[PDB]
Amino acid sequence: DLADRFAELERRYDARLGVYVPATGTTAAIEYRADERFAFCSTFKAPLVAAVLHQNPLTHLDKLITYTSDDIRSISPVAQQHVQTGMTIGQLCDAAIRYSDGTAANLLLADLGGPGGGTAAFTGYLRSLGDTVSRLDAEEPELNRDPPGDERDTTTPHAIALVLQQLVLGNALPPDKRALLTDWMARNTTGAKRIRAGFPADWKVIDKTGTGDYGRANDIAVVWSPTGVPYVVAVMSDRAGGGYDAEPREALLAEAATCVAGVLA
DSSP states (O other): OHHHHHHHHHHHHTOEEEEEEOOBTTBOOEEESTTSOEEOGGGGHHHHHHHHHHTSOGGGGGOEEOOOGGGOOSOOTTGGGOTTTOEEHHHHHHHHHHSOOHHHHHHHHHHHOSTTTTHHHHHHHHHHTTOOSOBOOOOTTGGGOOOTTOOTTEEOHHHHHHHHIIIIISSSSOHHHHHHHHHHHHTOSSOTTTHHHHSOTTSEEEEEEEEETTTEEEEEEEEEOTTSOEEEEEEEEEOGGGOTTOOOOHHHHHHHHHHHHHHHO
């Protein structure tokens, strides 16, 4: 019945919706278009920060990165007010997750390094986590703008959920680095009207949002029940039928999240 309810949501919002909640010791998977491709948009910044944490000692968080006003090529709420002082790697991680800072993300991609200013390195990091389908081809803001059907800069709800599961709940990162990623996602400022809006206030939610062209609106989260049981929730959406400037709908994610919370309570 839940699949029909997700289909009804799609009808109502004139959207395409993708959902994946991994199975647990006590719950079945929730999956809806979970193997279809959706643009990452800014949701890649969470695994990007993991990649940086993974391949460096924690002292690297204090490395100062300097940049100019001409490096501001995307929406960068934090970096554009620190051109004169620069930002540490840790400050860039914070900005990329909590403010979806695009310059921060591009600087972290460059820190991973290599041909394509880090997009190949990022894709390889996902490969190392067992993700054979996802790919990042462009940096910010071009990665938000690929036309429907283009596989560039896409993942699937299934793939990204399983990435986030390994990063936050599994052993992809050592527990100390894991904690840092989790804390940044816990203090995200961009996600209050998406998965958070769908779960009761006594559930803990940590998340990373994404928004882009063609009405793209995503949210990947880990939620903890009031009794401390965690679940990974990936919700992706697009309204490609409405053209490149179709309005993204946060409420669609919130309502998809309500359906999921109905199952997991």
